[PDB]
Amino acid sequence: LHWAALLILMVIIPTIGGNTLVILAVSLEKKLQYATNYFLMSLAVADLLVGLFVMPIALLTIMFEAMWPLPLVLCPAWLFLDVLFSTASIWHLCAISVDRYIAIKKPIQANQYNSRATAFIKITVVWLISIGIAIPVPIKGIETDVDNPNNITCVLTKERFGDFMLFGSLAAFFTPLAIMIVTYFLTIHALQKKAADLEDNWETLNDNLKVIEKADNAAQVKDALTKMRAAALDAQKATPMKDFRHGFDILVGQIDDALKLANEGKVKEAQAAAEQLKTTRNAYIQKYLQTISNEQRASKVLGIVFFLFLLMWCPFFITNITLVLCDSCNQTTLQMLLEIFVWIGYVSSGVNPLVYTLFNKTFRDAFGRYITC
């Protein structure tokens, strides 16, 4: 019967280990100390502290039923850290989702000297929000019938924390969730059209390259070549790899050269450079596909990391708020399966370090280096 603690403990090790490798990666690797990682490091801290302080002590309550091994003063303290590190983990993940969106539709303010300050005030707000939501628990302690901790269960009663579980769950989960849902459908939409603005502009670049290869006057070659300059300069905007955008710079440079010959009246000299453009295109055809190939791929991973979020915290926060409202429901049948949904919210702290690092090559090369010492 104590065997279940086996697998429960195999969930604690990755949480401690996984989140500790992220901290060791950002603080020791000189090539990983950019702004957006200082904020991801904070998510690992919360996920680490919840696997190092919350998750281990929560393991004792399953073994020592109706008992509290630690001093009774530390029961309201342990509960304070359960909500704190959890709300922080959720809001960090929420603040990541919104940045993943703004970082796509507008790569503005990409400087390393000024994007690091925004991360420092982005990280502090999350920790202040998480505190403000978890702060009332230690203030108004839990009421117990006994003084000795060996005869009590450390748990928040429905009566003493009724309006807190309701107004606290919204500010911690359903508020950032509402943001994460809209930022998701706006992100999948942000790369649905940009993946389409690249093709239609890429085909506008062909049709004009087809017509100037078949011309008789000097007006058609400069009408189609101007339509290329705009189309080529817009397709550059629809990319997230500077060398593919460098390919458009080379191309546009050749557009201006050939467009300069067209105004001098030399038709057959302009087409000499138009055939050179057809060569510039063939060099970046491969990288044009790997751009859309990486677009349809990034779209699905964003659906999984988002699906796993609602897959793990919903069963708890839905069951939690249900136990506060529904009186017809069997009170003992809800908190019997709620024990399960608590650990599902805990395991999220172990997947977060994985679904945000293993999809990157520089992290893998650095993890195996300290595993290797």
């Epitope: 003063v73 302690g141 839990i142 009421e143 006994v146 003084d147 429905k158 009566e159 009170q331 003992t332």
Partner: antibody, heavy 127, light 107 residues
Framework: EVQLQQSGPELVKPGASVKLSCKAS????????MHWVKQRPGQGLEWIGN????????NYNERFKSKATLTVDRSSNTAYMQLSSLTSEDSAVYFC????????????????????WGQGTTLTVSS | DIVLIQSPAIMSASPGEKVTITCSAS?????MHWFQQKPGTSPKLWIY???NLASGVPARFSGSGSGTSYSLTISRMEAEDAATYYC?????????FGAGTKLEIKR
């Protein structure tokens, strides 16, 4: 206004089951635990056990563990207690009472006195 | 378990003369409560915590106690407070009570 109305005195044959009720009034019933106390004159007071109405969790004394069974009913807002295999030594007066709760913060622990006892129930066992 | 031994089982004191009920414990206990039961009525708590009086209790009562041995002292003996006195333990389970101490007025 806090009033705990209990069942009436009863004579029950030995070996039969007893069902004592304890009605609550004046408060939400679910805020505090519901303790039970048996008083045999001359020997003093003995603690039977308590129960928590919300979750239905029950705790018994090591002696009265197999004898008494504590239950509640949120619909009728009463606290029951079933004594099975009634012997002759189980003839006493039984009370239902709520006791204060200790409120424990990281700073210190407070205790508030809300102890309110209910009317006794004289139980007698004889043929 | 944690039995509570309170001596004397019965005592008689005249008005003015003063009383000190002792309630000694089997183990070291955090706090100690006190109850007064007048025959024909249910017991009502008189001193919650080691030294704090309940609601409606006269100021002549004064409870003091250490860890093992606790006590209940009064200030001015009057006929209204003649009853049995039990002390109980709320530190740990099972909750234990004292045997009782009956007070007789000497008139």
């Amino acid at each position: 206004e806090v009033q705990l109305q209990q069942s009436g005195p009863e004579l029950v044959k030995p070996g039969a089951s007893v069902k004592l009720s304890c009605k609550a009034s004046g408060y939400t019933f679910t805020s505090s635990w519901m303790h039970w106390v048996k008083q045999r004159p001359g020997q003093g007071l003995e603690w039977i056990g308590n129960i928590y109405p919300s979750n239905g969790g029950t705790n018994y004394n090591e002696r009265f563990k197999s004898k008494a069974t504590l239950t509640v009913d949120r619909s009728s807002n009463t606290a029951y207690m079933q004594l099975s295999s009634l012997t002759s030594e189980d003839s006493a007066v039984y009370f239902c009472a709520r006791f204060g709760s200790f409120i424990t913060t990281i700073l210190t622990t407070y205790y508030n006195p809300v102890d309110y006892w209910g009317q006794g129930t004289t139980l007698t066992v004889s043929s | 378990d944690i039995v509570l031994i309170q001596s004397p089982a019965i005592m008689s004191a005249s008005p003015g003369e003063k009383v000190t009920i002792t309630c000694s414990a089997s183990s070291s206990v955090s706090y100690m409560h006190w109850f007064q039961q007048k025959p024909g009525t249910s017991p009502k708590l008189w001193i919650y915590s080691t030294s704090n009086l309940a609601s409606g209790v006269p100021a002549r009562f004064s409870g003091s106690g250490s860890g093992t041995s606790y006590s209940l002292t009064i200030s001015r003996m009057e006929a209204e407070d003649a009853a049995t006195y039990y002390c109980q333990q709320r530190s740990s389970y099972p909750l234990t009570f004292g045997a009782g101490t009956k007070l007789e007025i000497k008139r």
